[PDB]
Amino acid sequence: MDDIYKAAVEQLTEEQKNEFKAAFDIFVLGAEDGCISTKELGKVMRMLGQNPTPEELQEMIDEVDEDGSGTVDFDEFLVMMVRCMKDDS
């Protein structure tokens, strides 16, 4: 259950959260609503030198998005950040 994330997030230090929170604000550099969509991710990938298809971006979000809403919020972003880091424990 998402309980694992709760404990992982709760354990996280205030400084660690602030660092990720700062990135979140930057990520929405392309969103006025403060939400992260394919457009925001598309810009990030573009800088990295990657320019795939929009269909792939949508599918990627679905993989991380449990609701499949196609959008990523702060809560989802935080979970994704921790999940990605844990992936390599």
């Binding site: 660092e19 990720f20 700062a22 990135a23 930057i26 990520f27 990030v44 800088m47 990295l48 990657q50 990605c84 880091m85 992936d87 390599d88």
Partner: peptide, 27 residues
Amino acid sequence: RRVRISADAMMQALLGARHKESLDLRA
């Protein structure tokens, strides 16, 4: 297979953690 941006590239893209030149990967 042939995954992209495992996490190192992303960390460099933004502030996050320097993690030096690697985390727990040999060379």
